[PDB]
Amino acid sequence: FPTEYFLNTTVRLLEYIRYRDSNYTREERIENLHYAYNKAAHHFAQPRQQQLLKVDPKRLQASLQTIVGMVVYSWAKVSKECMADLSIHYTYTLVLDDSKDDPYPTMVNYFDDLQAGREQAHPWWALVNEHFPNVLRHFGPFCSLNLIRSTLDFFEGCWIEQYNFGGFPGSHDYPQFLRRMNGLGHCVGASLWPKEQFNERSLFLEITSAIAQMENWMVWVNDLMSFYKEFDDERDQISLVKNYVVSDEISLHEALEKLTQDTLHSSKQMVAVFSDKDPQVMDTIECFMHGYVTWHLCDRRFRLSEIYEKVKEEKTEDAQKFCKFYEQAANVGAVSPSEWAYPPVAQLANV
Amino acid sequence: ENFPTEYFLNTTVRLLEYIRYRDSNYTREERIENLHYAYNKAAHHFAQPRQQQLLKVDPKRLQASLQTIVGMVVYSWAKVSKECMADLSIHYTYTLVLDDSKDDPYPTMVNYFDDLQAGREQAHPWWALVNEHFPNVLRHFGPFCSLNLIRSTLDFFEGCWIEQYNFGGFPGSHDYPQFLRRMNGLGHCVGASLWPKEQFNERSLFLEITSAIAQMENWMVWVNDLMSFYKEFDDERDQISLVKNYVVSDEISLHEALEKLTQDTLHSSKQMVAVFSDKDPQVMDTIECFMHGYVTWHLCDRRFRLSEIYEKVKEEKTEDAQKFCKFYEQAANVGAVSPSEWAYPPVAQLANV
Ligand SMILES: [Mg+2]
Ligand SMILES: [Mg+2]
Numbered sequence: 041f042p043t044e045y046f047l048n049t050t051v052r053l054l055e056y057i058r059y060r061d062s063n064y065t066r067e068e069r070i071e072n073l074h075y076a077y078n079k080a081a082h083h084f085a086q087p088r089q090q091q092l093l094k095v096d097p098k099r100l101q102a103s104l105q106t107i108v109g110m111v112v113y114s115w116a117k118v119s120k121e122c123m124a125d126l127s128i129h130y131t132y133t134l135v136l137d138d139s140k141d142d143p144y145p146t147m148v149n150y151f152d153d154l155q156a157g158r159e160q161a162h163p164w165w166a167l168v169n170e171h172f173p174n175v176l177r178h179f180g181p182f183c184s185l186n187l188i189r190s191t192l193d194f195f196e197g198c199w200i201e202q203y204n205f206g207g208f209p210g211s212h213d214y215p216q217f218l219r220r221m222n223g224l225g226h227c228v229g230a231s232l233w234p235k236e237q238f239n240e241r242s243l244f245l246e247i248t249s250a251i252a253q254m255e256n257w258m259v260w261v262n263d264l265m266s267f268y269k270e271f272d273d274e275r276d277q278i279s280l281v282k283n284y285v286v287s288d289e290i291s292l293h294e295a296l297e298k299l300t301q302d303t304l305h306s307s308k309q310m311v312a313v314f315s316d317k318d319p320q321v322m323d324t325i326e327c328f329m330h331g332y333v334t335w336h337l338c339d340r341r342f343r344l345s346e347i348y349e350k351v352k353e354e355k356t357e358d359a360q361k362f363c364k365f366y367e368q369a370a371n372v373g374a375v376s377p378s379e380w381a382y383p384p385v386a387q388l389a390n391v
Numbered sequence: 392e393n394f395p396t397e398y399f400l401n402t403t404v405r406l407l408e409y410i411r412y413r414d415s416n417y418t419r420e421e422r423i424e425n426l427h428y429a430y431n432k433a434a435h436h437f438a439q440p441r442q443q444q445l446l447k448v449d450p451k452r453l454q455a456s457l458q459t460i461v462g463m464v465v466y467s468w469a470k471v472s473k474e475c476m477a478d479l480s481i482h483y484t485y486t487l488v489l490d491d492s493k494d495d496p497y498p499t500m501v502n503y504f505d506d507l508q509a510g511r512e513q514a515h516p517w518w519a520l521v522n523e524h525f526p527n528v529l530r531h532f533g534p535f536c537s538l539n540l541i542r543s544t545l546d547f548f549e550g551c552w553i554e555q556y557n558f559g560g561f562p563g564s565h566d567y568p569q570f571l572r573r574m575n576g577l578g579h580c581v582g583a584s585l586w587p588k589e590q591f592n593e594r595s596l597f598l599e600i601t602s603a604i605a606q607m608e609n610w611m612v613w614v615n616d617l618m619s620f621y622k623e624f625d626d627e628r629d630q631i632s633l634v635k636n637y638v639v640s641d642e643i644s645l646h647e648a649l650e651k652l653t654q655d656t657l658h659s660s661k662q663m664v665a666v667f668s669d670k671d672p673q674v675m676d677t678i679e680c681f682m683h684g685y686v687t688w689h690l691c692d693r694r695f696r697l698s699e700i701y702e703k704v705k706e707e708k709t710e711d712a713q714k715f716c717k718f719y720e721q722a723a724n725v726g727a728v729s730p731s732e733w734a735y736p737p738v739a740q741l742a743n744v
């Protein structure tokens with residue numbers, strides 16, 4: 041693991057975007073986390089959900105807490121109900137995100153069943169499409185369409201990843217093709233605009249623009265931040281950075297530099313474009329960018345604490361800047377699970 | 392002002408050389424037979440009373456649209472069956488025709504998902520016709536390729552929605568142009584529709600197919616953009632093409648925008664050849680026939696007006712000009728067919744009957 045370069049790149053990003061999280065007071069944070077967790081926990085504990093969603097209890101629990109954090113930390117302006125419903129949707133996607141399964145058999149009659157209104161054969165689709173209305177009720181038709189497309193894309197992306205194919209050497213378009221596919225970019229981007237707070241028709245151009253630009257910023261930031269948890273992980277391996285290596289036949293070092301440059305430029309344009317636009321829009325965008333980073337630095341899923349410990353000592357400016365940022369984020373989002381994530385889904389299921 | 396004829400010619404010849412544009416075993420008689428078969432089934436389809444009443448399109452525009460699409464399909468999907476060419480011609484005609492609607496989708500999309508999940512007919516009449524006909528297209532493909540057609544068509548619908556706003560992007564919104572082009576490009580629909588299950592094993596060639604979709608998406612939309620650059624140059628009605636959006640969103644000159652497209656198009660062409668040259672022969676054949684047929688369609692369909700360029704430089708002693716004309720003659724030689732030879736009777740005649 042290029043620890044030395046991981047610190048280099050991460051520091052460049054955090055410093056360039058001027059990472060800082062003022063999204064909530066600690067009381068507000070805990071309050072939202074618990075609300076979202078509580079509703080989702082009861083949802084996933086239902087027998088039907090327990091029966092069709094094939095996932096290890098411990099894994100479901102960890103996935104739910106990771107997503108509640110992501111939603112609460114990054115969608116700081118939407119209502120508690122919206123955070124909760126979104127948390128359920130993104131927990132379904134995270135579960136699929138780490139899974140190993142062959143969709144082929146259950147996708148043979150996908151369209152015909154869809155058109156006829158018959159329950160989907162793939163259990164994931166059966167649960168996701170049944171729950172979807174609870175998510176879409178928060179948005180106008182345009183944003184809703186984006187959520188639907190992006191989730192369908194994501195499903196295809198996880199399907200492709202099952203083949204552990206990083207692209208044919210020379211297939212330069214493959215890496216980003218897959219990343220957009222599995223990125224859930226338009227879903228995340230469009231889910232930032234609840235109709236309760238934003239009028240889809242009045243802000244059509246800014247929202248469309250935000251979806252287009254946020255898609256890349258969002259995915260790339262995760263490619264960089266999650267570069268650590270991914271790397272020695274089997275389910276991953278097939279990633280933008282590693283596919284850049286195989287497909288464009290370049291060095292991991294160059295791949296990371298490529299990713300970092302794109303990310304910095306994406307950040308740059310986010311500012312240029314939205315700085316002088318509707319204040320409410322800029323506010324939501326800012327809350328997302330900052331909270332999104334706080335989430336990557338704190339959440340267990342990305343285990344960046346491991347890199348903190350190993351680097352906490354050595355003083356190389358680059359290593360010190362990382363720990364500073366890591367500490368700053370921890371001071372805001374390092375909330376203990378016992379303060380909000382209870383009771384466990386399992387306990388509610390066996391009730 | 393003034394169309395960059397030189398640069399255009401150079402890029403075009405380069406494009407055709409990179410893709411190895413050359414004669415094939417696909418004859419004029421075969422084309423005519425396929426053209427008429429696809430046109431005949433599609434014409435009868437669109438002439439049905441239900442189609443006639445729900446699809447709001449001027450009859451002459453529909454006639455012209457169907458003819459251009461049938462040509463595009465018959466020429467580019469050279470390896471698929473007559474039925475497949477016919478069914479894809481209907482689908483791509485539905486997509487082309489949606490660009491004629493200026494009606495805000497908002498009202499008909501408010502209950503999109505609930506109706507979809509419940510199996511109730513969609514409120515937007517276009518979805519009603521398209522989703523009803525889709526099985527005829529999908530029956531030709533496996534589940535993976537099918538999913539791709541479904542997604543791409545859904546994206547296309549959103550793409551048409553966004554375009555009603557005549558928005559080329561905010562200055563500084565560098566990621567907007569390609570975001571929109573991919574939305575309205577039908578890249579994955581095209582890419583995945585090149586592999587009927589009757590001719591290819593989706594699972595066995597998953598890697599080849601997935602890679603083709605990824606690479607063909609960009610090659611196809613960019614070649615359409617490049618070849619359409621001439622007809623769109625002074626079209627004051629067409630305001631939001633990829634190139635014009637590059638100008639607005641990236642704040643660069645039309646020339647630079649054109650350069651960007653050229654570089655992407657040429658590079659894409661090279662990598663297509665490089666990647667698939669050594670793979671399965673049938674796969675490479677389908678891919679090569681698409682590229683050549685797609686180019687032949689652009690050179691032969693008058694909507695692109697490329698004849699005006701050929702006519703303007705057919706007597707120059709320049710290398711590029713000469714190479715262009717030879718390619719053009721190659722194209723016309725096998726692709727220049729009179730509509731009277733296959734596109735009959737008109738859809739309207741079949742409709743009033
Ligand atoms: Mg993933
Ligand atoms: Mg993942």
Ligand SMILES: [Mg+2]
Pocket residue numbers: 262263266267270
């Ligand atoms: Mg990742």
